[PDB]
Structure formats: structure tokens, C-alpha cells
Amino acid sequence: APSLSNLFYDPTYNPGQSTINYTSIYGNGSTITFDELQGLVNSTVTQAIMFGVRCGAAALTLIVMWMTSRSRKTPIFIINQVSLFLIILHSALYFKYLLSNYSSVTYALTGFPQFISRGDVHVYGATNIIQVLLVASIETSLVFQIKVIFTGDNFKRIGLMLTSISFTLGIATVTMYFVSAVKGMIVTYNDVSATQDKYFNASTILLASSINFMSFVLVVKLILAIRSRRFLGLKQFDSFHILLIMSCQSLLVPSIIFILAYSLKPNQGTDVLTTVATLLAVLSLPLSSMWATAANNA
Template identity: 40%
Template sequence: MSYSTAPNMFSDINPANLPINYTVADTVFTITFSKLDATLRESIRLGFAQGLGIGAASLLLFVSWFIVINKKTPMFILHQISLFLLIIRSGLYLGYLLGPFNSLGFKFTGLFDNNWDSFYVTIAVNTFYVLLIACIECILVFQIYVIFKSSKARSPSLIFPIISAALGVVVVVLYVIAVTHNLMRVKAEMTQRYRLFTSWETNIPFVMFAVSINYTCVLLVAKLVVAVRTRRVLGLKQFDAMHILLIMSTQTCIIPSIMVIYSYTPASQSSIYLNLSVIVVVCNLPFSSLWATAANNTASPCSSQNVVFSRSSTNESSERTLASFHKMSKIGTPATDYERGTLAESISEAAGMHGDVDSIEKILREVEQEQSYEH
């Protein structure tokens, strides 16, 4: 045998398919190296995802304290809580990944070394995960409430927040059930008392969570459509294409919605997308809240409220009344874009924020007649 042909002896062998035999309680088990590689890669991906969550949440937490002036609003407090919970949960999850429950020995043998500290870490990870989901649902409900709170029509202002709240309660309850049964299963494996649980306990909670995210996304996109139509009816400055694209991509939960849907598809084949979708949702909520609280009828199109990300005084809004516009008109001062925006805001409120063209035109005619009478 020549040395030149020796390496070809194993050229047709794929090392990933080589079997590994091990014995547990006189029972021989066989796995392949590819199975070990897949398990390690999954752990590495999950570790990167948790590191990304800690970094992104810490950055948003730090930046928001310097940018936001009014730190006593419910929206700001909820965002801070969700970011803080994400940091804690991701840190605990890293501890789980480095613990014995994520070791190859436990996963492939089921043998437990009687170290119950790792089980307590698992309980903490799941507890903070449920709290994080509950906080996310509270933010979604509050966003929808803010969207419809200025509406004069009582039905939309009540129905949509109630539906969102009902979805949130169902999601949280399902997650509590799923987490409880998951911990019971882990404890049963540790004590060699195996129990079977139905698949809906892990599937339905995330499906309902996806429904709540998509529900909020649809309403935020609908608000954008209504805002464009309202501004066109009122004759205000329109959103440009880049501004609409910015709102759609960062402030309507469209990306988290896509991530949540994809993470549940068979193509994902990994829990990494589920973890990333929750991280993206938490980090996107502060931006979507800007659009939820934005006014549709200001003189210049804007996707954020002054009280959220602007350092201007919040007392300006109290001065923007229809009476101030009449006062300026009576002394003969030409109406500026700011004043026309003030009038438009009052008109849209009188019309119920639903683009009631007849009501708007009627008010405009009355104002024009009063101005011509004064002059």
C-alpha cells in the first residue's frame, strides 16, 4: 500500500454520521456526531440571542432615560419594566445554558446529579418569562387604548381595547399553565417519574401571543391609513414616502409580527427564532408606542408626541385651542401653518377623528363666514 492512496481509505466516510454507543442501566443507546453538533450549535445560537437581548435592552434602557423628559407616564414605566425584565430573563437564561440541564450528559442520558440549584434557575427563567409576556400584553393593551381614547365614537374606543385586554388575559393564563406543566415535566425527569403532556400546552400559548401581536400590528397600520386620509381631507402637509416607510418598518410592529409568525413555521426548526421574536417585540414596543401616541392632525406630519421624545415644553399643547385661533384672526394676523394645524385639530376632534367630511366642511364654512363678518 502506498502512502499516496492511504488517505483515500476514509474519503467516503462522513464523520457526522459516525455512531456513538453508550450504555445506561444495561441499555445501549446510539447517537451520531451530527446530533451532538446540532445540540451544541443550538446552545450557541441561544447564547448569542440572550446576549443580543441583554445588549439591546440595556442600550434602550440607558438611552430612554436621557431622551424622555416625562418619566411618570404609564407608557414609559411599562417600557422600563419590560426592558428590565428582558435583561433579567436573558441573564438567567444564560445561567441555564451553562448549567447541568443544558449539558450533553443530561440531554442524552436523562441522569441527574441531584443538583437542585439548576432546577431553581429554571423556575426563575420561566417565572420572569411569564412576567415579561404579561408586561408585553399590558403595553399592547395600553397602546390600543391610547389610539382610540380621543375618539368621540364610544364603540371603537371600548371594543378594540376590550378585545386586546381579553387576548392579553388569555395569553398570560395559557403561559402560566404551559410553564407550570413544563416545570412539572422537568421535575418528573429529575426524579425518574416521567409524565406525558399534550402538545397544545406548548403550542397554543405562543399561537395566541402571535395573534395579539398581529392584532396590534393591524390596528397600528390602520391608524397610519386613517392618518394619511385625515390629513388629505384637512388639507394638511402630507407624509412623504420615507416617513411612511419609517413608520411602517419601525413603529407598527410589522417586523415583530413577521418574526413571531416565522418562528412558529416548520421552516424555523429551532427555538432561536422564538427567543428572537420576543426580544424584537420588547425592543420594538417603545418605537411603536411613539406612533400609537402620535397626533394625526398636527400642522407638520409627525410620528411621535412631544411628550415622548421631544425636549419642547408640554404646556404648548394646552395653548393650541380653537379660541386662540379666533383671537389671532380677529386682530387681522395671517394664519400660519401652526394655527391652521390648531384649527384642524379641533375640527377633527369635533368630527370624531373619523374623517367626517360634512362636519369638517360645515365648521370651515362657519369660520370663514365669521372672519368675513369681522372684516
């Protein structure tokens, strides 16, 4: 710092409108404002906090579930457990991605494939496969929850119908995330600069449909419970239904959050809400699965 300039005394500079004369593939002159750079950095800082939260959430729900379980060895326990372990592993590899050479400011501003190196594409593929090993956990948690919900004393017509439709929908979504993943692969390896997000988007719609369906089902069960307990029950549920509606016993909150996800800013680095729906669903699976594995009438 041999000397400053009068520009430093200017109280109304407002940096954010200035220029960066960087070098790109399009040439050695490419102006960009500090505000766009800071927004690109705030997208990374905004999408890192949520996956740190997910990693810590799943890590500290795994230990609690492990140590507190009164009864173990039931399929739903291991299923939710391995779901949270795939959450932790997905968050780990997504932290690797965030600090990797694909989220770097260099590739964003400067579309130079030479910065990219092989193996990072293997980490991208691995993450896209881990998302499928997570949705598979969720869906083999939900069919193995419906199979306990509707069975036994209940009628085998509504129950078989509900299980059939949920199983068909779930296998269909898993086949969607996969073909999506493979198509994304065949491109990211064919050409690093390409993208394929349509099938990802339709898969997210279909998962939102899966969780909306499960929530609709468990509120239908709540209506049926209240109706039966009114016929000749022990005074019904006295001030005990206040929780069930929206206290994460049911899947209402993720059903709202997915829907509010699309009504945000046009991707101002914040795709958080859809990252919140999956965490809240996988963390609420124990409560709904212990809500469904109940007598429901006495």
C-alpha cells in the first residue's frame, strides 16, 4: 500500500456496481459486477448451511434412535436408520461437491472444462446414486408403514387398494430418479458443461405426491378413528388430537413445504424448501410409523 486514492473518501461509492475484468472462454474481457459474484457465493453459503444441518440432524437422530429404542429388530427401525445413514453420506459427498471444482467461482464465471478433472465426475455420479439409495429407503419405509397401517382387523379392500397404489407409485418414482441419474451421467461424462434437470424435477413432484398421499392417508385414518370412537368409544380423544394435525406425527408439514417450495424467488441460490421437505419427512418417519402401529380403537 504505497498510497491510497480519493475514491476511498467518497461516501457514496456503494461497491456492488463496479467491474471485474476477468478472462473467460468468450475472451479476455468480461465485465461482471461484485453483486453477481456475491450472489453466486451466497448460493454456496446458503446451500451449505442446510446440508450441514442435515448431516448433524441425521447424525444426532441416529444415535438417539439407536440408544433409546425400547424394541429393536423390526423392519421399519432398520429402514429409517439406513435412511438417516444415507442422509449423512449424501451430506458428506455434497460437502465434497461444494468445496470441489464444480461449485468453484472459477467454473461459474469461467466456463473452462480444463479446470475439471476425472474422478470429480465419479463423485457427481456417486451422489446421484446415493439420492436413489435414499429415496429407496424412504419408499420401502412408506410401503412397510402402509402394510402395518391397513391390515388385520381393518377391511382388506381399502387396505389392499391403498397399499397397491402406494407401492406402484413408489416403484415408479424410484425408476424415475434412476433413469434421471443415468441420463445425467451419460451427459456429464459425454460433456461436462451440459445439464439434465427435467426428470429430476418430475421426480421431485412425484415424491411430493408420495408424501402428500401418505399424509392424506393418515388424516383419513384420524377421521376414521374419531368417527369410530364417537360411535361407542371411551369419550374419544380428549384434547389429544391437537398434536396430530401439524406436530409432525402426520406428514402435513412436508406436504405444505414442498408446495411452498416452488413459490419462492426464481432460484436466488435458495432451493432450501425442497431440501427441508426430505429432512422433515425422514425425521418424522418414526412418529408416523409409531402412530400407524397402534390399536386405533379400544
